[PDB]
Amino acid sequence: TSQIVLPPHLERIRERLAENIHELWVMNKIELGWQYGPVRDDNKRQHPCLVEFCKLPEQERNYNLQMSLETLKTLLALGCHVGIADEHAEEKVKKMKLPKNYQLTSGYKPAPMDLSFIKLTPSQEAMVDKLAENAHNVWARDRIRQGWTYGIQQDVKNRRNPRLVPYTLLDDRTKKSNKDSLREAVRTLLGYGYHLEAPDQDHASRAEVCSGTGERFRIFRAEKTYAVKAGRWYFEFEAVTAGDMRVGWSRPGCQPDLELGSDDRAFAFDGFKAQRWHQGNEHYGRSWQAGDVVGCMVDMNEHTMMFTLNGEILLDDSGSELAFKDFDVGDGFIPVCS
Amino acid sequence: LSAASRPLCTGGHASNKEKEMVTSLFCKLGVLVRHRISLFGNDATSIVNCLHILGQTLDARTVMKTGLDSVKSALRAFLDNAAEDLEKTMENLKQGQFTHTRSQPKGVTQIINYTTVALLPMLLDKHNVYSIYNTRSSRERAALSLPANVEDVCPNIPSLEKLMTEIIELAESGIRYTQMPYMMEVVLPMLCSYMSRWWEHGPENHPERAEMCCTALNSEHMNTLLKIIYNNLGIDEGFSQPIINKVKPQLLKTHFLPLMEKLKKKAAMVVSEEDHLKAEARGDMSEAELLILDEFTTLARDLYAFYPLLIRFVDYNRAKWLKEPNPEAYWSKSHNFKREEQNFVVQNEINNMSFLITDTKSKMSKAAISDQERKKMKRKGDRYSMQTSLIVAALKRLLPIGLNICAPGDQELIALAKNRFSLKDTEEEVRDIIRSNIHLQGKLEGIANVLFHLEQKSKY
């Protein structure tokens, strides 16, 4: 996916934020341990890229500015208001706080301060993960165009990377360095004083409750020849996961196709909705934990119905041991399930 | 059309406009009811002295009921509609309710007070931006020590405005946040400190008349919710409080127990009232990590079970004093109750023999005796139901002793319930005086003969 464009009003704030984030990034890179290198001598721990922001070449500076612009675009494109109130103190509202700490060695070592005491917004980790996912789409597109680190049909490359799958193959341990870098970036943002909301929380209706419903429903019952007519029978049903399950009695099929407990042909009881099912909805019974036995029981002589969940009889709001009453004998009743 | 508190959403704008009308009419009532002159603007074309309104006194009472009770299912509907302005609207409504109950109104708004209080458990400024409890703190400083402030400190000193059951019902309504706290835990503790300190420093009896139910003052009582009367503690502390210091509340809870255990008075209405006050003062409402720390819970429950079993053992026919004590649910207390019940069944059988033949005169006295017996049965039915529920589960794995102990009581009640119409009509009258008043059976989370206790005893 690709996100919205940066409005022209934010260009100055983007430039200032990019400048200070380049400064912090380059001094963090210098603090990492590598030194200055003339030309491509990484084997000697000498990095030409590890220079100050002002000392960066034109191409590297343009690439870094474009990367910062893309990250700021991604940050502002979520939808939550990013109206900055605590402006970063640099030549505008000057409240210089970086030289509060001080570390220096042989080389250019400016002093950054990261305010970790401030409360990180709960949605900031979501922003970090969304940045990672957007960059995953970026390098997925790049590898689709190129064919790098894996030869599928050309058989030119080998050692396929797990970056093709965005989340499943790449565990949190594999990308700890990138996660810590993004955490440091958002920590610097919070130290600057950005206040962020949490749209993807309980404040706004955004949670996903069920993958689907209204179909993929099945009915389980025995042969019609076992339709009991007399006596009082007992059978057991056990539940493994809470959900839309109807357990009760059915009849030989007369209605074309309808769910349990919503017509003449079927009697049903539910605990997930805590309501019995018989030609409508009527609240009855409690829910069940994982690994519970419904414990069904038949009373055919006086046309009464009732249940025993784990030996505990279920009583309705009126306080009775009667799930159903006053129904015709019909062509018998059969244990049924949904 | 942006959806917000009152940007465009008419569904919530209805209740918010009701709240705005409440605020406007509360200002219009603060200009008139607390006139402080009572003669300004006299003879409003007939006799009336009004503060430039003269027509909104009854209309405010008519519309406040609709404004505060915008929907019967207030708890769910308010949360579904919004989660921002509910706290401030309820705070302003409660402040206006207090500043109206300070005065003498003709109609009583206890039902609306309870309806507004029902919003408090359901769950903003977090009591920081807006001081919701400032007016309540003033009204609570008015009676910060009821045994010490039972005098003319109440505003205008009538016997009907504040010095009545109205203040205790208002306190019970206002202080209820068991489901979720809705405050910063600052402005309530330093009134609760005075209340608890004077509770310990009282040693006083013979309270004021018409307010015998002092037990309805607090329902969310717990640790930090006494030696901290604050005169030197304010300088000592102001960072340190009972939240961090876990020593003193445990010491006070351990101090409370032997004093209440020592009370073993027999055959006294004053003993009954003292026991009820003791149960309310130091009951089982202390929810401070009772699940993890089980020794305190076990000791407290054992004492709260040993007290009434030994109290109501002898005859104690006058059981009307106990309104609705909290039960606070194999056991030694269960065995003791089984022995007490099987001893009580003998007196019940003697009474049944008396009812069978040689009946007394004065059919109205027959009704009175049957009412007393029905009250005793109603009081014992709840504890019998819990005991039967405990016994049935106990006898499942291995407990023939419980079933053998419970067997004679089944036959005792079966013999008692053969033909008792002269008791059944009186029991129906007693249960019609107050229908259930707790509806304990329907909670699934007051009582007659053939219910849960009977079916659980018969099921085995």
mmCIF file with all atom_site columns, N, CA, C and O in Angstrom, chain B residues 166-210:
data_model
loop_
_atom_site.group_PDB
_atom_site.id
_atom_site.type_symbol
_atom_site.label_atom_id
_atom_site.label_alt_id
_atom_site.label_comp_id
_atom_site.label_asym_id
_atom_site.label_entity_id
_atom_site.label_seq_id
_atom_site.pdbx_PDB_ins_code
_atom_site.Cartn_x
_atom_site.Cartn_y
_atom_site.Cartn_z
_atom_site.occupancy
_atom_site.B_iso_or_equiv
_atom_site.pdbx_formal_charge
_atom_site.auth_seq_id
_atom_site.auth_comp_id
_atom_site.auth_asym_id
_atom_site.auth_atom_id
_atom_site.pdbx_PDB_model_num
ATOM 1   N N  . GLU B 1 166 ? -32.465 11.617 54.768 1.00 0.00 ? 166 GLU B N  1
ATOM 2   C CA . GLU B 1 166 ? -32.081 12.154 53.467 1.00 0.00 ? 166 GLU B CA 1
ATOM 3   C C  . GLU B 1 166 ? -30.568 12.193 53.304 1.00 0.00 ? 166 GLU B C  1
ATOM 4   O O  . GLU B 1 166 ? -30.048 11.838 52.242 1.00 0.00 ? 166 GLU B O  1
ATOM 5   N N  . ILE B 1 167 ? -29.842 12.611 54.345 1.00 0.00 ? 167 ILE B N  1
ATOM 6   C CA . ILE B 1 167 ? -28.391 12.722 54.224 1.00 0.00 ? 167 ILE B CA 1
ATOM 7   C C  . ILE B 1 167 ? -27.747 11.342 54.121 1.00 0.00 ? 167 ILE B C  1
ATOM 8   O O  . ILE B 1 167 ? -26.783 11.153 53.369 1.00 0.00 ? 167 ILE B O  1
ATOM 9   N N  . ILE B 1 168 ? -28.271 10.351 54.848 1.00 0.00 ? 168 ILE B N  1
ATOM 10  C CA . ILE B 1 168 ? -27.672 9.021  54.795 1.00 0.00 ? 168 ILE B CA 1
ATOM 11  C C  . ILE B 1 168 ? -27.964 8.362  53.448 1.00 0.00 ? 168 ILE B C  1
ATOM 12  O O  . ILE B 1 168 ? -27.098 7.688  52.872 1.00 0.00 ? 168 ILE B O  1
ATOM 13  N N  . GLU B 1 169 ? -29.162 8.590  52.896 1.00 0.00 ? 169 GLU B N  1
ATOM 14  C CA . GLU B 1 169 ? -29.463 8.064  51.569 1.00 0.00 ? 169 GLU B CA 1
ATOM 15  C C  . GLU B 1 169 ? -28.645 8.778  50.501 1.00 0.00 ? 169 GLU B C  1
ATOM 16  O O  . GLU B 1 169 ? -28.198 8.152  49.534 1.00 0.00 ? 169 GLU B O  1
ATOM 17  N N  . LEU B 1 170 ? -28.423 10.084 50.671 1.00 0.00 ? 170 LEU B N  1
ATOM 18  C CA . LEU B 1 170 ? -27.585 10.830 49.741 1.00 0.00 ? 170 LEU B CA 1
ATOM 19  C C  . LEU B 1 170 ? -26.147 10.332 49.772 1.00 0.00 ? 170 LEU B C  1
ATOM 20  O O  . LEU B 1 170 ? -25.501 10.221 48.727 1.00 0.00 ? 170 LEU B O  1
ATOM 21  N N  . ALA B 1 171 ? -25.627 10.034 50.966 1.00 0.00 ? 171 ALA B N  1
ATOM 22  C CA . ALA B 1 171 ? -24.273 9.500  51.074 1.00 0.00 ? 171 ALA B CA 1
ATOM 23  C C  . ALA B 1 171 ? -24.170 8.124  50.427 1.00 0.00 ? 171 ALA B C  1
ATOM 24  O O  . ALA B 1 171 ? -23.220 7.844  49.683 1.00 0.00 ? 171 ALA B O  1
ATOM 25  N N  . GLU B 1 172 ? -25.149 7.251  50.696 1.00 0.00 ? 172 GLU B N  1
ATOM 26  C CA . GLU B 1 172 ? -25.138 5.920  50.094 1.00 0.00 ? 172 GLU B CA 1
ATOM 27  C C  . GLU B 1 172 ? -25.231 6.002  48.576 1.00 0.00 ? 172 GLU B C  1
ATOM 28  O O  . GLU B 1 172 ? -24.583 5.228  47.861 1.00 0.00 ? 172 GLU B O  1
ATOM 29  N N  . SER B 1 173 ? -26.035 6.936  48.068 1.00 0.00 ? 173 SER B N  1
ATOM 30  C CA . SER B 1 173 ? -26.144 7.136  46.629 1.00 0.00 ? 173 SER B CA 1
ATOM 31  C C  . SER B 1 173 ? -24.835 7.654  46.043 1.00 0.00 ? 173 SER B C  1
ATOM 32  O O  . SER B 1 173 ? -24.316 7.099  45.067 1.00 0.00 ? 173 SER B O  1
ATOM 33  N N  . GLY B 1 174 ? -24.275 8.705  46.644 1.00 0.00 ? 174 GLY B N  1
ATOM 34  C CA . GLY B 1 174 ? -23.101 9.344  46.072 1.00 0.00 ? 174 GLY B CA 1
ATOM 35  C C  . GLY B 1 174 ? -21.858 8.475  46.099 1.00 0.00 ? 174 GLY B C  1
ATOM 36  O O  . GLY B 1 174 ? -21.121 8.407  45.111 1.00 0.00 ? 174 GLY B O  1
ATOM 37  N N  . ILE B 1 175 ? -21.601 7.800  47.219 1.00 0.00 ? 175 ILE B N  1
ATOM 38  C CA . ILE B 1 175 ? -20.366 7.029  47.379 1.00 0.00 ? 175 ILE B CA 1
ATOM 39  C C  . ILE B 1 175 ? -20.683 5.595  46.962 1.00 0.00 ? 175 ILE B C  1
ATOM 40  O O  . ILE B 1 175 ? -21.138 4.772  47.758 1.00 0.00 ? 175 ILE B O  1
ATOM 41  N N  . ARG B 1 176 ? -20.467 5.307  45.675 1.00 0.00 ? 176 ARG B N  1
ATOM 42  C CA . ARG B 1 176 ? -20.562 3.938  45.166 1.00 0.00 ? 176 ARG B CA 1
ATOM 43  C C  . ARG B 1 176 ? -19.718 3.864  43.893 1.00 0.00 ? 176 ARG B C  1
ATOM 44  O O  . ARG B 1 176 ? -20.173 4.282  42.824 1.00 0.00 ? 176 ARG B O  1
ATOM 45  N N  . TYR B 1 177 ? -18.503 3.336  44.019 1.00 0.00 ? 177 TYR B N  1
ATOM 46  C CA . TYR B 1 177 ? -17.598 3.174  42.883 1.00 0.00 ? 177 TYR B CA 1
ATOM 47  C C  . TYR B 1 177 ? -16.884 1.831  42.961 1.00 0.00 ? 177 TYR B C  1
ATOM 48  O O  . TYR B 1 177 ? -15.684 1.730  42.690 1.00 0.00 ? 177 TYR B O  1
ATOM 49  N N  . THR B 1 178 ? -17.618 0.782  43.342 1.00 0.00 ? 178 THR B N  1
ATOM 50  C CA . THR B 1 178 ? -17.014 -0.541 43.475 1.00 0.00 ? 178 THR B CA 1
ATOM 51  C C  . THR B 1 178 ? -16.544 -1.082 42.129 1.00 0.00 ? 178 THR B C  1
ATOM 52  O O  . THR B 1 178 ? -15.469 -1.687 42.039 1.00 0.00 ? 178 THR B O  1
ATOM 53  N N  . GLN B 1 179 ? -17.341 -0.885 41.076 1.00 0.00 ? 179 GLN B N  1
ATOM 54  C CA . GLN B 1 179 ? -16.986 -1.418 39.765 1.00 0.00 ? 179 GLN B CA 1
ATOM 55  C C  . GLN B 1 179 ? -15.755 -0.725 39.192 1.00 0.00 ? 179 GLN B C  1
ATOM 56  O O  . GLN B 1 179 ? -14.857 -1.388 38.657 1.00 0.00 ? 179 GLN B O  1
ATOM 57  N N  . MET B 1 180 ? -15.691 0.602  39.295 1.00 0.00 ? 180 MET B N  1
ATOM 58  C CA . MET B 1 180 ? -14.553 1.350  38.773 1.00 0.00 ? 180 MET B CA 1
ATOM 59  C C  . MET B 1 180 ? -14.433 2.697  39.475 1.00 0.00 ? 180 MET B C  1
ATOM 60  O O  . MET B 1 180 ? -15.395 3.475  39.494 1.00 0.00 ? 180 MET B O  1
ATOM 61  N N  . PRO B 1 181 ? -13.284 2.992  40.085 1.00 0.00 ? 181 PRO B N  1
ATOM 62  C CA . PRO B 1 181 ? -13.075 4.323  40.667 1.00 0.00 ? 181 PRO B CA 1
ATOM 63  C C  . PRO B 1 181 ? -13.185 5.416  39.612 1.00 0.00 ? 181 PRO B C  1
ATOM 64  O O  . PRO B 1 181 ? -12.786 5.237  38.459 1.00 0.00 ? 181 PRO B O  1
ATOM 65  N N  . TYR B 1 182 ? -13.732 6.559  40.017 1.00 0.00 ? 182 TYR B N  1
ATOM 66  C CA . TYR B 1 182 ? -13.928 7.703  39.133 1.00 0.00 ? 182 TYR B CA 1
ATOM 67  C C  . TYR B 1 182 ? -13.406 8.977  39.780 1.00 0.00 ? 182 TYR B C  1
ATOM 68  O O  . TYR B 1 182 ? -14.037 10.035 39.713 1.00 0.00 ? 182 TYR B O  1
ATOM 69  N N  . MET B 1 183 ? -12.240 8.894  40.416 1.00 0.00 ? 183 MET B N  1
ATOM 70  C CA . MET B 1 183 ? -11.663 10.034 41.113 1.00 0.00 ? 183 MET B CA 1
ATOM 71  C C  . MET B 1 183 ? -10.159 9.833  41.245 1.00 0.00 ? 183 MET B C  1
ATOM 72  O O  . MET B 1 183 ? -9.625  8.758  40.957 1.00 0.00 ? 183 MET B O  1
ATOM 73  N N  . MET B 1 184 ? -9.480  10.888 41.691 1.00 0.00 ? 184 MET B N  1
ATOM 74  C CA . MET B 1 184 ? -8.031  10.891 41.832 1.00 0.00 ? 184 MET B CA 1
ATOM 75  C C  . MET B 1 184 ? -7.561  10.411 43.200 1.00 0.00 ? 184 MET B C  1
ATOM 76  O O  . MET B 1 184 ? -6.354  10.448 43.465 1.00 0.00 ? 184 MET B O  1
ATOM 77  N N  . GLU B 1 185 ? -8.482  9.976  44.066 1.00 0.00 ? 185 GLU B N  1
ATOM 78  C CA . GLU B 1 185 ? -8.158  9.442  45.393 1.00 0.00 ? 185 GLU B CA 1
ATOM 79  C C  . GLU B 1 185 ? -7.419  10.469 46.250 1.00 0.00 ? 185 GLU B C  1
ATOM 80  O O  . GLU B 1 185 ? -6.421  10.156 46.903 1.00 0.00 ? 185 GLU B O  1
ATOM 81  N N  . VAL B 1 186 ? -7.909  11.709 46.248 1.00 0.00 ? 186 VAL B N  1
ATOM 82  C CA . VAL B 1 186 ? -7.275  12.787 47.000 1.00 0.00 ? 186 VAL B CA 1
ATOM 83  C C  . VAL B 1 186 ? -8.285  13.468 47.917 1.00 0.00 ? 186 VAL B C  1
ATOM 84  O O  . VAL B 1 186 ? -8.056  13.598 49.124 1.00 0.00 ? 186 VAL B O  1
ATOM 85  N N  . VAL B 1 187 ? -9.409  13.906 47.347 1.00 0.00 ? 187 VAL B N  1
ATOM 86  C CA . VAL B 1 187 ? -10.339 14.755 48.087 1.00 0.00 ? 187 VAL B CA 1
ATOM 87  C C  . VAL B 1 187 ? -11.263 13.921 48.971 1.00 0.00 ? 187 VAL B C  1
ATOM 88  O O  . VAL B 1 187 ? -11.796 14.414 49.972 1.00 0.00 ? 187 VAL B O  1
ATOM 89  N N  . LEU B 1 188 ? -11.499 12.665 48.604 1.00 0.00 ? 188 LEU B N  1
ATOM 90  C CA . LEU B 1 188 ? -12.269 11.780 49.474 1.00 0.00 ? 188 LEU B CA 1
ATOM 91  C C  . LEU B 1 188 ? -11.472 11.218 50.654 1.00 0.00 ? 188 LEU B C  1
ATOM 92  O O  . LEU B 1 188 ? -12.058 11.104 51.748 1.00 0.00 ? 188 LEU B O  1
ATOM 93  N N  . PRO B 1 189 ? -10.198 10.809 50.513 1.00 0.00 ? 189 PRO B N  1
ATOM 94  C CA . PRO B 1 189 ? -9.484  10.268 51.682 1.00 0.00 ? 189 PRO B CA 1
ATOM 95  C C  . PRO B 1 189 ? -9.340  11.222 52.857 1.00 0.00 ? 189 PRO B C  1
ATOM 96  O O  . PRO B 1 189 ? -9.355  10.750 53.998 1.00 0.00 ? 189 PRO B O  1
ATOM 97  N N  . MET B 1 190 ? -9.199  12.532 52.651 1.00 0.00 ? 190 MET B N  1
ATOM 98  C CA . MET B 1 190 ? -8.978  13.356 53.836 1.00 0.00 ? 190 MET B CA 1
ATOM 99  C C  . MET B 1 190 ? -10.281 13.812 54.491 1.00 0.00 ? 190 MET B C  1
ATOM 100 O O  . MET B 1 190 ? -10.230 14.557 55.474 1.00 0.00 ? 190 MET B O  1
ATOM 101 N N  . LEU B 1 191 ? -11.436 13.385 53.974 1.00 0.00 ? 191 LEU B N  1
ATOM 102 C CA . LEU B 1 191 ? -12.676 13.368 54.745 1.00 0.00 ? 191 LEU B CA 1
ATOM 103 C C  . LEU B 1 191 ? -12.915 12.006 55.387 1.00 0.00 ? 191 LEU B C  1
ATOM 104 O O  . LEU B 1 191 ? -13.395 11.924 56.529 1.00 0.00 ? 191 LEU B O  1
ATOM 105 N N  . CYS B 1 192 ? -12.587 10.933 54.658 1.00 0.00 ? 192 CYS B N  1
ATOM 106 C CA . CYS B 1 192 ? -12.720 9.592  55.214 1.00 0.00 ? 192 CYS B CA 1
ATOM 107 C C  . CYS B 1 192 ? -11.802 9.393  56.412 1.00 0.00 ? 192 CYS B C  1
ATOM 108 O O  . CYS B 1 192 ? -12.121 8.614  57.315 1.00 0.00 ? 192 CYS B O  1
ATOM 109 N N  . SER B 1 193 ? -10.664 10.090 56.434 1.00 0.00 ? 193 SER B N  1
ATOM 110 C CA . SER B 1 193 ? -9.771  10.030 57.585 1.00 0.00 ? 193 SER B CA 1
ATOM 111 C C  . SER B 1 193 ? -10.446 10.589 58.829 1.00 0.00 ? 193 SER B C  1
ATOM 112 O O  . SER B 1 193 ? -10.394 9.977  59.899 1.00 0.00 ? 193 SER B O  1
ATOM 113 N N  . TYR B 1 194 ? -11.102 11.747 58.704 1.00 0.00 ? 194 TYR B N  1
ATOM 114 C CA . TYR B 1 194 ? -11.831 12.299 59.842 1.00 0.00 ? 194 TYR B CA 1
ATOM 115 C C  . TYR B 1 194 ? -12.964 11.374 60.267 1.00 0.00 ? 194 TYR B C  1
ATOM 116 O O  . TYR B 1 194 ? -13.171 11.145 61.467 1.00 0.00 ? 194 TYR B O  1
ATOM 117 N N  . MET B 1 195 ? -13.693 10.817 59.294 1.00 0.00 ? 195 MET B N  1
ATOM 118 C CA . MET B 1 195 ? -14.807 9.925  59.619 1.00 0.00 ? 195 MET B CA 1
ATOM 119 C C  . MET B 1 195 ? -14.335 8.692  60.386 1.00 0.00 ? 195 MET B C  1
ATOM 120 O O  . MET B 1 195 ? -14.882 8.361  61.445 1.00 0.00 ? 195 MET B O  1
ATOM 121 N N  . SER B 1 196 ? -13.304 8.011  59.880 1.00 0.00 ? 196 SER B N  1
ATOM 122 C CA . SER B 1 196 ? -12.813 6.805  60.543 1.00 0.00 ? 196 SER B CA 1
ATOM 123 C C  . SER B 1 196 ? -12.135 7.121  61.872 1.00 0.00 ? 196 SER B C  1
ATOM 124 O O  . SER B 1 196 ? -12.269 6.351  62.837 1.00 0.00 ? 196 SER B O  1
ATOM 125 N N  . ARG B 1 197 ? -11.408 8.240  61.947 1.00 0.00 ? 197 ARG B N  1
ATOM 126 C CA . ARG B 1 197 ? -10.776 8.630  63.200 1.00 0.00 ? 197 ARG B CA 1
ATOM 127 C C  . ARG B 1 197 ? -11.814 8.884  64.279 1.00 0.00 ? 197 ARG B C  1
ATOM 128 O O  . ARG B 1 197 ? -11.648 8.442  65.421 1.00 0.00 ? 197 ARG B O  1
ATOM 129 N N  . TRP B 1 198 ? -12.911 9.568  63.939 1.00 0.00 ? 198 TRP B N  1
ATOM 130 C CA . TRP B 1 198 ? -13.942 9.775  64.949 1.00 0.00 ? 198 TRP B CA 1
ATOM 131 C C  . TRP B 1 198 ? -14.729 8.502  65.225 1.00 0.00 ? 198 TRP B C  1
ATOM 132 O O  . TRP B 1 198 ? -15.263 8.339  66.328 1.00 0.00 ? 198 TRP B O  1
ATOM 133 N N  . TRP B 1 199 ? -14.815 7.593  64.250 1.00 0.00 ? 199 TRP B N  1
ATOM 134 C CA . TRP B 1 199 ? -15.408 6.287  64.520 1.00 0.00 ? 199 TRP B CA 1
ATOM 135 C C  . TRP B 1 199 ? -14.617 5.544  65.589 1.00 0.00 ? 199 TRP B C  1
ATOM 136 O O  . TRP B 1 199 ? -15.199 4.903  66.471 1.00 0.00 ? 199 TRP B O  1
ATOM 137 N N  . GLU B 1 200 ? -13.287 5.620  65.524 1.00 0.00 ? 200 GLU B N  1
ATOM 138 C CA . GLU B 1 200 ? -12.472 4.987  66.557 1.00 0.00 ? 200 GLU B CA 1
ATOM 139 C C  . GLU B 1 200 ? -12.496 5.771  67.868 1.00 0.00 ? 200 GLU B C  1
ATOM 140 O O  . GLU B 1 200 ? -12.477 5.173  68.950 1.00 0.00 ? 200 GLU B O  1
ATOM 141 N N  . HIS B 1 201 ? -12.545 7.101  67.797 1.00 0.00 ? 201 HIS B N  1
ATOM 142 C CA . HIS B 1 201 ? -12.434 7.943  68.983 1.00 0.00 ? 201 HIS B CA 1
ATOM 143 C C  . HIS B 1 201 ? -13.780 8.296  69.604 1.00 0.00 ? 201 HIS B C  1
ATOM 144 O O  . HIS B 1 201 ? -13.822 9.121  70.523 1.00 0.00 ? 201 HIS B O  1
ATOM 145 N N  . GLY B 1 202 ? -14.871 7.703  69.125 1.00 0.00 ? 202 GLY B N  1
ATOM 146 C CA . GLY B 1 202 ? -16.184 7.927  69.685 1.00 0.00 ? 202 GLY B CA 1
ATOM 147 C C  . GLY B 1 202 ? -16.392 7.456  71.117 1.00 0.00 ? 202 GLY B C  1
ATOM 148 O O  . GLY B 1 202 ? -16.568 8.277  72.024 1.00 0.00 ? 202 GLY B O  1
ATOM 149 N N  . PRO B 1 203 ? -16.298 6.119  71.364 1.00 0.00 ? 203 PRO B N  1
ATOM 150 C CA . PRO B 1 203 ? -16.987 5.514  72.512 1.00 0.00 ? 203 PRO B CA 1
ATOM 151 C C  . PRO B 1 203 ? -18.245 6.223  72.995 1.00 0.00 ? 203 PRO B C  1
ATOM 152 O O  . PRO B 1 203 ? -18.345 6.594  74.168 1.00 0.00 ? 203 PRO B O  1
ATOM 153 N N  . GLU B 1 204 ? -19.208 6.416  72.096 1.00 0.00 ? 204 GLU B N  1
ATOM 154 C CA . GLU B 1 204 ? -20.462 7.077  72.423 1.00 0.00 ? 204 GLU B CA 1
ATOM 155 C C  . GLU B 1 204 ? -21.636 6.214  71.984 1.00 0.00 ? 204 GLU B C  1
ATOM 156 O O  . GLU B 1 204 ? -21.576 5.523  70.963 1.00 0.00 ? 204 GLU B O  1
ATOM 157 N N  . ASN B 1 205 ? -22.709 6.259  72.774 1.00 0.00 ? 205 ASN B N  1
ATOM 158 C CA . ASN B 1 205 ? -23.945 5.559  72.446 1.00 0.00 ? 205 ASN B CA 1
ATOM 159 C C  . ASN B 1 205 ? -25.109 6.542  72.405 1.00 0.00 ? 205 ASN B C  1
ATOM 160 O O  . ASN B 1 205 ? -24.900 7.756  72.502 1.00 0.00 ? 205 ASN B O  1
ATOM 161 N N  . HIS B 1 206 ? -26.334 6.019  72.258 1.00 0.00 ? 206 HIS B N  1
ATOM 162 C CA . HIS B 1 206 ? -27.570 6.796  72.219 1.00 0.00 ? 206 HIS B CA 1
ATOM 163 C C  . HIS B 1 206 ? -27.521 7.832  71.101 1.00 0.00 ? 206 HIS B C  1
ATOM 164 O O  . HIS B 1 206 ? -27.430 9.037  71.372 1.00 0.00 ? 206 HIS B O  1
ATOM 165 N N  . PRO B 1 207 ? -27.573 7.407  69.837 1.00 0.00 ? 207 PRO B N  1
ATOM 166 C CA . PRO B 1 207 ? -27.507 8.375  68.733 1.00 0.00 ? 207 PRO B CA 1
ATOM 167 C C  . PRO B 1 207 ? -28.791 9.174  68.574 1.00 0.00 ? 207 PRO B C  1
ATOM 168 O O  . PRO B 1 207 ? -29.745 8.995  69.337 1.00 0.00 ? 207 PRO B O  1
ATOM 169 N N  . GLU B 1 208 ? -28.821 10.060 67.581 1.00 0.00 ? 208 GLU B N  1
ATOM 170 C CA . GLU B 1 208 ? -29.985 10.905 67.358 1.00 0.00 ? 208 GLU B CA 1
ATOM 171 C C  . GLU B 1 208 ? -31.168 10.083 66.857 1.00 0.00 ? 208 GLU B C  1
ATOM 172 O O  . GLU B 1 208 ? -31.007 9.039  66.220 1.00 0.00 ? 208 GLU B O  1
ATOM 173 N N  . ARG B 1 209 ? -32.369 10.569 67.156 1.00 0.00 ? 209 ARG B N  1
ATOM 174 C CA . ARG B 1 209 ? -33.588 9.897  66.739 1.00 0.00 ? 209 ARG B CA 1
ATOM 175 C C  . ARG B 1 209 ? -33.834 10.103 65.247 1.00 0.00 ? 209 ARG B C  1
ATOM 176 O O  . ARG B 1 209 ? -33.258 10.989 64.610 1.00 0.00 ? 209 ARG B O  1
ATOM 177 N N  . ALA B 1 210 ? -34.692 9.244  64.690 1.00 0.00 ? 210 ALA B N  1
ATOM 178 C CA . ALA B 1 210 ? -35.121 9.220  63.293 1.00 0.00 ? 210 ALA B CA 1
ATOM 179 C C  . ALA B 1 210 ? -33.982 8.947  62.316 1.00 0.00 ? 210 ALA B C  1
ATOM 180 O O  . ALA B 1 210 ? -34.208 8.985  61.101 1.00 0.00 ? 210 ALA B O  1
#
